[PDB]
Amino acid sequence: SMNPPPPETSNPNKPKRQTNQLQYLLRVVLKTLWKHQFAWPFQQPVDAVKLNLPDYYKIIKTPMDMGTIKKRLENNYYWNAQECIQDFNTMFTNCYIYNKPGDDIVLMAEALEKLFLQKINELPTEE
């Protein structure tokens, strides 16, 4: 089945702001996750056509990936850090819903998620 368009990453009509926490989410969290050895399947939308997963977008109706998150952060798409954190969590959750526990892709997600949680533990206070 066709892939859907990727998630919106820029909205001219949606107010913008920079905060310490959003800067940290881009320059620390996204950066560190991106460089992880297991990051590659998470760096762009799931290409269900290429991967021959005709049921992927029948099951997953709230897709997310780190390529989209990088753009949202760069485009100052988020008003607050919680919106961005939610996107990371959605990305991991989708992986867990579609796949079986113990599958390689799930172990990979779990490694990134642990790293993610470690980094959000050190989220700066919104000074």
Ligand X SMILES: COc1ccccc1Oc1nccc(-c2c(-c3ccc(F)cc3)ncn2C2CCNCC2)n1
Q: How far is the CB of 118 from ligand X (least distance, A)?
A: 19
Q: How far is the CB of 75 from ligand X (least distance, A)?
A: 21
CB 57 within 8 A of CB 14: no
CB 64 within 8 A of CB 46: no
Q: 26 vs 45, which CB is nearer to ligand X?
A: 45
Helical axes 104-120 vs 81-98, angle rounded to 10°:
160
Q: How far is the CB of 38 from Cl ion (least distance, A)?
A: 13
Closest to 76 in 3D by CA, of 6, 8, 32, 15: 15
Per partner kind, with CB cut-offs from 5 to 8 A, the member of Cl ion, ligand X, none near residue 99 is ligand X
Q: 8 vs 51, which CB is nearer to ligand X?
A: 51
